[PDB]
Amino acid sequence: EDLRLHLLLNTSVTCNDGSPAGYYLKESRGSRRWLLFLEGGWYCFNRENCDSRYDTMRRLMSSRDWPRTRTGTGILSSQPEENPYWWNANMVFIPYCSSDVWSGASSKSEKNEYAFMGALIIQEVVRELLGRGLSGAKVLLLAGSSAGGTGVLLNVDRVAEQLEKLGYPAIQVRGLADSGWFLDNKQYRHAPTEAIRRGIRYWNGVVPERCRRQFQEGEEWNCFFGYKVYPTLRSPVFVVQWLFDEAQLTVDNVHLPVQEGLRLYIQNLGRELRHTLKDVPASFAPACLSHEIIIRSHWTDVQVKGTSLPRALHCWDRSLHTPLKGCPVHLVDSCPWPHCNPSCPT
Ligand SMILES: O=C(O)CCC(=O)N1CCc2ccccc21
Ligand SMILES: *[C@@H]1O[C@H](CO)[C@@H](O)[C@H](O)[C@H]1NC(C)=O
């Protein structure tokens, strides 16, 4: 039970219900690598659906029932057997308790039943970790899965800007976005663009500055879609995305003998996803029907073109020291149907 809970000392930075947000930390003395992982878990965007989430998903809205420890798994494991990539790093798990895809900057108040403080939670965790050893870091990898993967895209450059202004320009900030690269595509039957548009207003959601300047007022929802926000980012970002992501299929109103219309729909989804990753140099996109990878204990098992994700991430680290012999970083399946890759999760 190796990561220990710390509630934020700034208790004005809160989960949805006003309880303090926080982070779980396992230090690694002598490592200058820091991994900050953003949990996922959908979102809510109005009073009624946030109230329902509060009834049955309360740990995603409140710290009141959080345990004092959590076990690090996958990329958060400290065992090299489970985590070939960063087993010796300082590990931080940031629970998702803001329901805002890590974008919010609004407090609970006279006018607001809930606080949506995801963007401020990340900033406050960073600021409090600086006094716990992060000041000595050489690399800060902001990672996340699901809504936390989108949260990486939305926040990695702000973490970089925050550290620059605080006087730490030597800390290299990088992003690892897992299962947070979604398409605003046609549904199979006739959605996130509208839910996100409403959420931004309900949350006081913030997006990266260059993306905001491109899309402008009322169109900031566009910045929640990876293929649109990614080209605006300055920090190096590695993108992990199943080609047939289960959350993508859910928001597309697909639920799984497949007939021609659905076959063509699924094949087109994989082709569109692949297309959006063509110019993403650090990416890992297997042709599987699944969701999330990096904190799963068996995350080492899947391979694209014979290369596992821990290996690809290691090659990315080397690339950030011309391509490297036998150590690739751009790994996107080309086969067109779920589980055409034999290494897909069972
Ligand atoms: O992965 C998760 O936690 C669940 C799904 C999720 O979060 N989705 C799906 C659609 C979308 C568009 C923009 C931002 C986020 C999301
Ligand atoms: C606490 O967090 C709030 C919201 O981000 C910020 O405005 C304020 O400066 C912080 N206060 C302290 C003492 O860190």
Ramachandran bin of 157, using left for φ above 0, alpha for ψ from -120 to 50, beta for the remaining angles: alpha
* Token duo for residue 145: 């899965």
Cβ–Cβ contacts within 10 Å for residue 276, how many? 22
Distances (CA, A) of 344 to 76, 288, 302: 21, 6, 6
Resolution in A: 1.3
CB 203 within 8 A of CB 100: yes
d(Cα 174, Cα 35) in Å, to the nearest integer? 10
Q: Match 């006279």 to its residue by tokens.
A: 110
CA distances from 60 to 21, 42, 117, 242 (A): 11, 9, 13, 24
Positions annotated as catalytic residues are 146, 245, 291
Residue 144 pairs in a beta bridge with 38, 177
Contacts of 162 (CB under 8 A, 6+ apart): 123, 126, 127
Cα angle 180, 181, 183 (rounded to 5 degrees) comes to: 125
Choosing from 38, 150, 187, 225 the residue with most ligand 1 atoms within 8 A of its CB, the one to mutate for a pocket test is 150
What separation in Å is there between the alpha carbon of 25 and the centre of ligand 2? 21
Residues 162, 126: contact at Cβ < 8 Å? yes
Q: Give which of 344, 310, 302, 345 is closest to 329, Cα–Cα.
A: 310
Q: Contact at 8 Å (CB) between 17 and 44?
A: no
Query: Which residue is associated with the tokens 């936390």?
Result: 148
Contact 115, 100 (CB under 8 A): no
Q: How far is the CA of 298 from the centre of ligand 1 (A)?
A: 23
Which residues are within 8 A (CB) of 286 and not within 5 positions of it... i.e. 6 or more apart? 242, 243, 302, 303, 304, 333, 341, 343, 344
- CA–CA separation, 82 and 157 (whole Å): 29
Hey, what are 169's tokens?
């320009």
Ligand index nearest the alpha carbon of residue 118: 2
CA of 106 to the centre of ligand 2 (A): 12
- What is the Cα 35 distance to its own chain's centre? 12
